[PDB]
């Protein structure tokens, strides 16, 4: 503390040297000295007790200390920590603003990484320094308390410390009228941290808080209005009831603060419209202010002069701007007012899309895109004019105009594909393919994403141009960076999903596969760049089907290795977590999905590969995995392999079914769906041998059917599975026919007459023959299910007729008359004519 103190001071002066090499070499020393027990004893000493040396040196040591708290604080001796905690609280409100801010950031850091409860008398001291007549001590404590409330937004406790916000919050509200704007801004910032959290200490002061907010509403300092605006936005959700009286006064206030001097204030005031547009009373209040708000929102969607510099041209900007916030606000408002928003948009929109200034024109196109979803039914008449114009905007000289044009066109893709292909679709697809190979990297991703969107709405409408589409996409595999390669992977994979088996042509495979095999061979099993590639190949393998035969073996082998290694590393981590790290299961999930692609694509051709491999054992380990997505992907592989090669899956049914029966829990939808679908596919292959496995599966399935909410995809899948289960073993399914048939019929009556609908109904008829007692009570639903059929197969029709006539003979021609009269006309007439 005297013979080694100058040894550190010289390192502080040397660390401030303008030489780059000298800096990093000394910074390393302060890490090699950090491993000493009382090295941090010096850093805090220089900051507070060494008031002889210059300020930037004293500050630097305190900031080196701070970095020695954000790291290596787990090894911080309690004796030394007690020293720093005491010295900082002492020098709160130091004369030098540089030293004070250095001290303040130490307190907020120690209380952040190190926990708050480990510093007991932190809040009681800071909250008692707010009354100090020394302004610096007041600001220093208040500036720290703000960062504490931000870092510790929780620790509201309500029974952990003392609920310190019972004294702090009422004290905070008193500082809303303090002289200094810097103090007022602090006071409002602290309270705002406990608005959404429904703080009981603040909610019983909600009247004093709002009244104090109205006073600070017209403050000069923008940092005050910034916080006041944020507070009102938050109060719009949690305590809407206390704003209705002063509602229109606030809306006007927010409407001016949206056009505020400080853009920072303008953003927070703009979030008010997003919040308000999600409230039930929105469509009642804003109607008055609509003609005055709409142009303000649109005008804010223009590119600022700063953005046009960051975005070169005449992802380098923030995630949230005034532009994106106004775009979002206009998006949501469009879905609230629907077509009633058009009279406020269409006039100014007409004078925006054909404007000569590119900035003003670009913002106009964005407006057209934002209101697409909501005002769709009102924009359709204006589309035959706008759509051909936007396709021309794809050829604009400006880059930012071309990119936004791709996106706006993609939001009307549903209408374009509904129209004749050769008027909109063909020129749009052509011009969009041109922007994929654009010179500007930003326009590329915009078009490649827009094209991927176009492919989903068009599907088989792109089959004629499938050679034109592929030539552009494949060529794009040579001039694309790693950022846009992801979008390309999506566009290619989406194409295969859209055109389906139409992609299975020799000339297509000849150009589409070699670039994919290129990336395949250049990546190692640890590179996370495999995730987008194999997801793409999963769609391609499913589409190419048998055309994927010459590529199956090297793909199949590597996928098994990925799953096997991921599971092996998982076992190692489970045994010794300290020596072996946990593996990324995304490698396993992705590899399993590609295996499903092969099984679904090749079918029986994968039989030789499923055998001579341990994929069955690996799947058995994947189904037990903690991660639901892993279980989701493995169950999907089980079903696809059930159809492909059941002769290899059959010896493992005994241990598969109990796991399948366990994962019939609707908490994880996708897991429950794939499990249910797997059971159904297994039932077909088993036959009457499915008998012992039914009781541990059926009870869940019936529960899922009668279960409220739930997606239709799970209801349909559960009905088909039960139907397939009833077809193979009627004895163990028929007695419970009485209690699932009501939602069973309503679920399958809206499905087209396909194979899945056939096998399900073929089962409901089999367990109606056995125990017909269950269909009698709710026979109204079975009729509507049968009358939904247009062209059922002959044997299934005979089954329907034999059941309907059977019921008709049970009740008589007179009872059947009165019973059939409650049917709608087309349903009543169909049953009479068909059966």
């Amino acid at each position: 503390d005297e013979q080694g103190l100058q040894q550190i001071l010289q390192l502080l002066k040397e660390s401030q040297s303008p030489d780059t090499t000298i800096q990093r070499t000394v910074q390393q020393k302060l890490e090699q000295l950090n491993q000493y027990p009382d090295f941090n004893n010096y850093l805090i000493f220089v900051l507070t007790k060494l008031k002889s040396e210059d300020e930037p040196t004293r500050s630097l040591s305190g900031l080196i200390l701070k970095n020695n708290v954000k790291a290596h604080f787990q090894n911080f001796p309690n004796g030394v920590t007690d020293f720093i905690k005491s010295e900082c609280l002492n020098n709160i409100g130091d004369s030098s603003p540089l030293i004070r801010a250095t001290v303040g950031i130490l307190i907020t850091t120690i209380a952040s990484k190190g926990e708050l409860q480990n510093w007991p008398d932190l809040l009681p001291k800071l909250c008692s320094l707010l009354d100090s007549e020394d302004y610096n001590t007041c600001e220093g404590a208040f500036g720290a308390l703000q960062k504490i409330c931000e870092d510790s937004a929780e620790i509201l406790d309500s029974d952990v410390l003392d609920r310190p916000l019972n004294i702090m919050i009422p004290k905070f509200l008193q500082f809303f009228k303090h002289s200094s704007p810097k103090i007022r801004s602090h006071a409002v910032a602290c309270v705002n941290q406990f608005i959404i959290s429904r703080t009981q200490a603040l909610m019983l002061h909600i009247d004093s808080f709002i009244e104090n907010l109205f006073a600070l509403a017209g403050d000069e300092e923008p940092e005050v209005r910034k916080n006041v605006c944020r507070a009102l936005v938050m109060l719009l959700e949690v305590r809407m009831d206390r704003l209705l009286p002063h509602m229109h006064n606030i809306v006007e206030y927010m409407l001016q603060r949206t056009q505020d001097q400080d853009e920072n204030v303008a953003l927070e005031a703009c979030e008010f419209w997003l919040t308000l547009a999600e409230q039930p009373i929105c469509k009642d209040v804003l109607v008055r202010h609509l003609p005055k708000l709409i142009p303000v929102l649109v005008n804010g969607m223009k590119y600022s002069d700063i953005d046009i510099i960051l975005l070169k041209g005449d992802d380098t900007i923030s995630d949230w701007n005034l532009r994106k916030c106004s775009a979002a606000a206009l998006d949501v408002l469009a879905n609230v007012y629907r077509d009633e928003l058009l009279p406020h948009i269409l006039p100014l929109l007409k004078e925006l899309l054909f404007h000569h200034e590119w900035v003003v024109k670009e913002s106009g196109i964005l407006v057209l895109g934002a209101i697409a979803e909501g005002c769709m039914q009102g924009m359709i008449p204006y589309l035959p004019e706008l759509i051909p114009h936007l396709i021309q905007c794809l050829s604009d000289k400006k880059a930012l105009v071309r990119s936004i044009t791709c996106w706006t066109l993609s939001r009307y893709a549903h209408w374009v594909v509904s129209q004749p292909p050769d008027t909109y679709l063909k020129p749009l697809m052509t011009e969009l393919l041109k922007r994929i190979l654009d010179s500007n990297k930003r326009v590329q991703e915009a078009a490649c994403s827009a094209f991927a969107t176009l492919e989903e709405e068009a599907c088989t409408e792109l089959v004629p141009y499938l050679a034109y589409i592929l030539d552009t996409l494949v060529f794009a595999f040579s001039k694309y960076q790693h950022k846009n390669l992801l979008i390309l992977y999506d566009a290619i994979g989406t194409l295969a999903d859209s055109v389906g088996h139409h992609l299975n042509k020799p000339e297509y495979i000849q150009m589409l596969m070699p670039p994919l095999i290129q990336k395949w061979n250049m990546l190692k099993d640890e590179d996370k760049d495999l995730f987008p590639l194999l997801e793409c190949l999963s769609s391609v393998a499913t589409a190419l089907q048998s055309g994927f035969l010459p590529y199956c073996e090297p793909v199949y082998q590597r996928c098994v290795n990925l799953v096997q290694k991921t599971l092996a590393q998982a076992m190692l981590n489970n045994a010794q977590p300290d020596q072996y790290e946990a593996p990324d299961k995304d490698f396993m999930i992705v590899a399993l999905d590609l295996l499903s692609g092969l099984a679904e694509g090749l079918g029986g051709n994968i039989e030789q590969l499923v055998a001579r491999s341990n994929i069955l054992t690996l799947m058995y380990q994947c189904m037990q995995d903690k991660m639901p997505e892993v279980r989701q992907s493995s169950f999907a592989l089980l079903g696809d392999l059930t159809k492909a090669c059941f002769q290899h899956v059959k010896p493992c049914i005994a241990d598969f079914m109990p796991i399948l029966g366990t994962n019939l829990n609707p908490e994880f939808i996708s897991v429950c769906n794939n499990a249910t679908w797997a059971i159904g596919e297994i039932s077909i292959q088993m036959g009457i041998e499915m008998q012992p496995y039914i009781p541990m599966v059926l009870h869940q399935l019936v529960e899922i059917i009668n279960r409220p909410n739930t997606p239709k995809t799970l209801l349909e899948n559960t009905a088909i599975t039960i139907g397939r289960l009833g077809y193979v073993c009627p004895q163990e399914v028929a007695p419970m026919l009485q209690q699932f048939i009501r939602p069973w019929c309503t679920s399958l009556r809206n499905i087209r007459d396909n194979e899945e609908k056939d096998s399900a109904f073929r089962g409901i008829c089999t367990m109606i023959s056995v125990n017909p007692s269950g269909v009698i009570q709710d026979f109204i639903f079975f009729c509507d299910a049968v009358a939904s059929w247009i062209n059922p197969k002959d044997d299934l029709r005979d089954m329907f007729c034999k059941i309907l006539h059977g019921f008709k003979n049970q009740v008589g021609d007179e009872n059947w008359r009165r019973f059939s009269d409650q049917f709608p006309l087309p349903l009543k007439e169909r049953l009479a004519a068909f059966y």
Binding site: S410, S449, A452, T453, L486, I487, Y489, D490, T494, F531, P532, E535, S538, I589, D593, S596, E629, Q632, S633, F635, A636, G639, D640, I669, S670, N673, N674, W677, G680, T713, E716, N717, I720, I751, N754, E756
Partner: peptide
């Protein structure tokens, strides 16, 4: 129809949908 649930969307597909 029913079948299996769609695969997990990645960064790109989720960004547009």
């Amino acid at each position: 129809t029913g079948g299996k649930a769609p695969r997990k969307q990645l960064a790109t597909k989720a960004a547009r949908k």
